Specification:
The structure is a homodimer.
Chain A lengths: L1 E2 L6 E6 L13 H18 L7 H5 L5 E9 L8 E10 L5 E9 L5 E10 L14 H7 L30 E6 L14 H8 L5 H6 E10 L9 E7 L3 E9 L5 E11 L1
Antiparallel strand pairs in A: 1-2, 2-4, 3-6, 3-8, 4-5, 5-6, 7-9, 8-11, 9-10, 10-11
Helix pairs in contact in A: 1-4
The complex binds 4,6-dimethylpyrimidin-2-amine (2 copies).
The site of one 4,6-dimethylpyrimidin-2-amine (5ZE) has 8 residues of chain B, from strand 3.
Chain lengths: 264, 265
């Protein structure tokens, strides 16, 4: 991978691996979510980060995902080359936004796109807060000044309010515990695991007869290593579903989202 | 990736990804096991396989893993290039053997090596069978004629008999169900998931103060999508040895058994 000519975005090609595809011989949405996360990490290293800034490290402040939205038009097949272009952008005092464009390496056409909202939060306390001093100026030099959105369209699927799933849920997958492979380098549950857990309540018949077109996921709380999750789903409709991830015990909401599926 | 000059082995380089490393910023043993499986799939595709042969597809026979042995000297760090060289070899009427050599792309030294035993199974009835004469002459052209072992040694740990864990187990991880990410393109539980499940019963303190040096894993039965596994472990030993056992939570049907060796950091 490498930064573009202007240095305001990063590009990287990937070859789809055999263990990364589903029954239809095309990359799974979790594989795509992993590749976006990988290209975002490389963009952060290529600009001098480790993701954190100078003032963000002297003060115990980290970046945490608040929302992830992924729209796929074509899933790359096992063996295909896919180029993802990512970039950061300021969103005022709210936080940072990171967008991605998935392209086919042979045809050059956009096969998918994604957007994500990020918030501040103290590492040692887990608050929210916001700052504009050194922090805003530190990443402003690595972001395009004029608006560059992956989903520009006024009133689009990436900015909609997600409602809370009412009980009882139509479908459910209970007793979901994360394992060492689900944790990251800091021993925190990877954000991609929540995507796989949300899709665990989707019926197998829906998966075998439909393709996941859109997936919006709001992040409310972090599932810990010793926690157990309950995935809940209800059909609201193409097929639309409302999702809810909560701790098996108290019923503490950790995630909520929506999925759209097209007939094959 | 690409086949070597003689065409009797395949080489492929990989860049270690951020999501593929553990707490020590080095690739996990499951990531390594995935890269060996990926380089093995590309070697099969490059020689004209898909990894069944012409007679194997006609007779409804497939290749199944019976044993996996992995010995790691150095785990590649996040961002490092690692080149794995794999090759097939006939093992008489028992089956095939596939070996791997992990090397560092910058220093060129061997950072790990692995071996695996494969058997022929009827796709439909899941009945194991000895390799017939017609099948052996189809893949012999893609295997080196003279013995080429990754673990040649007189008494290596890749050919040792693994005993069954006695009850009660010292450590255990109960209620392990596979998810859609654990299944492969044929909806079968990936062989790498069993490695991650075996290590689920290993204490967190052992992981945080030791590095996995050797892992031998015998495959007895396959875990299905709707099955639940119980991982069991017992210490048998500076180095620490453990005996493992994977069994279905219900009936207690053994699906896997193995051993792990760990050295102090
Ligand atoms: C916005 C947000 C996201 C996450 C994962 N946790 C918290 N507390 N807040
Ligand atoms: C040797 C072997 C391996 C597996 C996964 N299943 C069976 N039946 N036999």
């Amino acid at each position: 991978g490498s930064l573009t000519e202007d240095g305001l975005s990063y590009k990287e090609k990937f070859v789809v691996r055999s263990y990364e595809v589903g029954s239809n011989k095309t990359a799974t949405v979790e594989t795509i979510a992993n590749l976006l996360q990988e290209v975002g990490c490389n963009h952060a290293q290529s600009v001098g980060f480790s993701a954190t800034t100078t003032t963000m490290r002297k003060l115990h402040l980290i970046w945490v995902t608040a929302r992830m939205h992924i729209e796929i038009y074509k899933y790359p097949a096992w063996g295909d080359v896919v180029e993802i272009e990512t970039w950061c952008q300021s969103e005022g005092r709210i936080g940072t936004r990171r967008d991605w464009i998935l392209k086919d390496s042979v045809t050059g056409e956009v096969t998918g796109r994604a957007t994500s909202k990020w918030v501040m939060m103290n590492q040692d306390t887990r608050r929210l807060q916001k700052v504009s001093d050194d922090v805003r100026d530190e990443y402003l030099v690595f972001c395009p000044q004029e608006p560059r959105l992956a989903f520009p369209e006024e009133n689009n699927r990436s900015l909609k309010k997600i409602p809370k799933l009412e009980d009882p849920a139509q479908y459910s997958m209970i007793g979901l515990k994360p394992r060492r492979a689900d944790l990251d380098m800091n021993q925190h549950v990877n954000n991609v695991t929540y995507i796989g857990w949300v899709l665990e309540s989707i019926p197998q018949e829906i998966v075998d007869t439909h393709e996941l077109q859109v997936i919006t996921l709001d992040y409310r709380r972090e599932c810990q290593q010793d926690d157990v999750v309950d995935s809940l789903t209800t059909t609201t409709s193409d097929s639309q579903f409302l999702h809810l991830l909560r701790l098996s015990g108290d019923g503490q909401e950790i995630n909520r989202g929506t999925t759209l599926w097209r007939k094959k």
